[PDB]
Amino acid sequence: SKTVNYFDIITIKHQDTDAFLHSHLARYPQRYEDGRISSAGQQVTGYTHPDFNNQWEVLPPHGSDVGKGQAVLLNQHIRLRHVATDTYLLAHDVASPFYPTNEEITTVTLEEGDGELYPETLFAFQPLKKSDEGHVLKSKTVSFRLFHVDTSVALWTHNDELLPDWGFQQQEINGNKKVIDPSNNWVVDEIV
């Protein structure tokens, strides 16, 4: 158990399924079988194997009084850069692959993510208890919800149904509008 500092590279692991927050260059299909239209953006998935594509760099917001080599505190605003593809995690009001009521999770290019879409790239390590606000984020021993600031959803995954072949049968990740739910619980598994 060690402190997570800004600009550390981390892996983020789901408590109920053991899946890691993962990404790769593959994109969502333009249309799902039920006819809904996705954003055709980059996929974000839950992956049960340790891997380089599970790595995310924790970054401060644009004009922040936090810097590198300083601890991340619970409920502070952060951004997550996927290391392997150099893209920013983002959520938005687009129906997810398997849950029409939950939000699609994607990544965007640095240019898009630092421009008009920037507000949608902000997240928080939300404490399970609001009273733990301001406590230091640590690996392994601190549970949190990965909370999207702009739409107030919590990143969620499941393993009862897996993605189709375009997603390598990895787990769907989506934004759950019911924030307080143990299935929204994640931990930082390792600091790279």
């Binding site: 239209i37 996705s38 954003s39 687009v94 129906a95 029409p100 939950n102 699609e104 934004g175 509008k177």
Partner: peptide, 4 residues
Amino acid sequence: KTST
């Protein structure tokens, strides 16, 4: 496109 399709909203949640």
